[PDB]
Amino acid sequence: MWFEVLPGIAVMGVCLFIPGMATARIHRFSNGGREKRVAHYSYQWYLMERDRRVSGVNRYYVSKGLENID
Amino acid sequence: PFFDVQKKLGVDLDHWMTIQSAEQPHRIPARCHAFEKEWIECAHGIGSIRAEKECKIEFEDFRECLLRQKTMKRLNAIKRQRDKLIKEGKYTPPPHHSG
């Protein structure tokens, strides 16, 4: 039966388990624990652009919530 | 000949394709909407010769909306003079991004 092929399937499956896992782990690492903000359209682009404007660092992912109310 | 059975049969099956300020699929402007509005409202009931004579200013205003050729002439002159005086070294300006 298939008892002698499953190590090949398992190793090659980890070879396909790695790239999305490392991808999403890098994207969570790449914005300080927040997800990579996508931007489809012009409106969401200008929203993300004022986001990177009002953080001071010109890095949007801080996003400065409820602190500059005053 | 030039036939306008198009106009006669009461169907504008072609003329929506034609100019800006016709109604877009969502009611959105073009870039030079108001300038075409200017030029047509100068030259609506006009026979295309005193249109050449008298609506010439606003037609040039429309052409310079579309191309912005004189504006790029001005801006290129300003950038080349900026570059020659920064190669010179006389009063290198910092007022962008700083004081």
Binding site: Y41 | Q24, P25, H26, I28, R80
Partner: protein, 175 residues
């Protein structure tokens, strides 16, 4: 550092496309042609058009596929020509690339190029969208008008394509 990247893609486009137009064997012509089509797709994609360039790259590609099939079919030499094989093709390629680099020189290190118009030589971040609120990526609706308002236009388009099909069929049949 770089800013003229649309113009530089246009320069690469014109180089490959002139070496295309200098007429070597259609194998090398198609190679330079698909290079030119891909970088032209890059030009129009980087300019603001979302799908239209990738679309036309696909269509134009399939046309070049059939063109390659027929140049394998019909026009073959005992040894086909390359760019650097014959005198005339080499001269045309060098002179076309020479005119290209000369235009590069007169744009970069000079002011104005006035062959047919007084073309303003500076970078193509002007003119451009000044951050207008799209929310629907304009060219998508700009093609979506074709089935809304486009009554007469696709009628004559499909009619002419049907006629194109029967025309090819009867010219092949007419033996």
């Amino acid at each position: 550092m770089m800013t003229y990247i649309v113009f530089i893609l246009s320069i690469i486009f014109v180089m490959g496309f002139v070496g295309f137009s200098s007429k070597p064997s259609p194998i090398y012509g198609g190679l330079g042609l698909i290079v030119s089509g891909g970088v032209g797709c890059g030009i129009v994609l980087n300019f603001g058009g979302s799908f239209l360039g990738l679309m036309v790259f696909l269509i134009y590609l399939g046309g070049m596929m059939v063109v390659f099939g027929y140049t394998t079919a019909m026009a073959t030499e005992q040894y086909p020509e390359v760019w650097v094989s014959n005198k005339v093709v080499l001269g045309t390629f060098i002179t076309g690339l020479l005119m290209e680099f000369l235009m590069v020189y007169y744009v970069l290190k000079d002011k104005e190029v006035e062959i047919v118009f007084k073309f303003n030589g500076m970078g193509d971040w002007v003119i451009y969208d000044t951050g207008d609120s799209g929310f629907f990526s304009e060219e998508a609706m700009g093609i979506a008008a074709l089935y809304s308002y486009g009554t007469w236009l696709v009628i004559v388009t499909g009619w002419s394509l049907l006629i194109g099909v029967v025309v090819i069929m009867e010219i092949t049949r007419g033996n």
